[PDB]
């Protein structure tokens, strides 16, 4: 729509990623590559609120952003991911999520949202953009035959609804996670996906703060591929622009003037996967197009970096109880540490293979 949340705003740079990057860059031995690595701390990323323990940091980021804006005469914008559903990651082998449906998951998740809202409420001069619950709704489209997902459906819908409804009250601009071209972009998945997203939008009152959808989060697809990646055979929507061009009109037709954001943080190198479903620490990935509202599409508000490159997707150690065997595949960089922890060699390659170059 006419209101692109990023226009006229300075994005607050994640202090946590900045510290990870600074520690990483000092370990890189080549001076030029080290300088390029250090500059990554100046590229805006999303901060993942993957547990209640992250909420105090959110409060500090909002207050820091408010003061930076006043000091520089700018309006500041903080980028967050809401990522703490009960029975999170229902189609994965295991999950690190602190809440379970069986132990008051709904109420605990609502309290997590309430704590986030209570922070955001205190800093009305800071804009907030939130990606809502990566993987969750996409799993409800294609993975209902996973019994954990089938059993989680009502909780996921109620929790996502609670998040949308209550974050809207503090004016947060929200993009529901919507998988990627190889997940929901298959032509046959577009209508079931559109029907689900539209129902979620309706249940949350069609708030204008529910801007649309986020795609490619934590994935590696091109926004606009020079030629189709071989993993995409059978799907005419072989990149994110094809997916979004196909899905956006279905949402519009339902009355939702929906726009999109697209993760490109690990999309600099294409044609690095054996299978489209391979998602874990894909070897040879490079940093991709840096965040910008110059997206080339009427449907896309911004290219963004949602998943922070260098933070691991999962361990390759089969003895870990958090182990997911996708993290031991051939196209997966190994050995790899636990999910979320820093993967230094992977970061160094992300820097070295960045496209455009850093």
From TrEMBL:
Region (Disordered): 311-331
Composition bias, Polar residues: 314-328
Active site: 89, 135 (proton donor), 313 (proton acceptor)
UniProt GO BP: cellulose catabolic process
Cysteine-cysteine disulfides: 90-149, 280-327
EC number: 3.2.1.-
UniProt keyword annotations, A-Z: Carbohydrate metabolism, Cellulose degradation, Disulfide bond, Glycosidase, Hydrolase, Polysaccharide degradation, Signal
Keyword Acetylation: no
Keyword Signal among UniProt keywords: yes
Binding residues annotated for substrate, in chain numbering: 48, 50, 180, 183, 219, 279, 307, 311
Domain of life where this protein originates: Eukaryota
GO cellular component, one term: extracellular region
GO MF assignments: cellulose binding; hydrolase activity, hydrolyzing O-glycosyl compounds
Similarity comment: Belongs to the glycosyl hydrolase family 6.
Protein name: Glucanase
Record lineage: Eukaryota, Fungi, Dikarya, Basidiomycota, Agaricomycotina
Residue window of the full protein shown: 82 to 439 of 439
